[PDB]
Amino acid sequence: GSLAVNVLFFVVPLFLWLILQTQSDQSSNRDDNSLTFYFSNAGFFFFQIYTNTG
């Protein structure tokens, strides 16, 4: 087909990772939502019944 186009398609995941890294740099200095697994509910699930027996 096209060598240049095939190479560009091959290197797409690296391009996405690099763009995400650059925008993470942008989020870090603006104190924006970072790309992390946020842990603010201490393991409590979304709408979960938490009751006891006895």
Residue 27 CA, chain-centre distance (Å), reads 12
Contact in structure between 44 and 50 (CB atoms under 8 Å): yes
Query: Taking CB under 8 A as the rule, does residue 8 contact another protein?
Result: no
Residues 11-40, one symbol each (x = binds another protein by CB under 8 A, - = not), give -xx--xx--xx--x------xxxxxxxxxx
User: Whole-angstrom Cα distance, residue 13 to residue 51?
Assistant: 45
Nearer to another protein, 3 or 40 (CB): 40
Site residues (CB under 8 A) for another protein? 12-13, 16-17, 20-21, 24, 31-45, 50-54
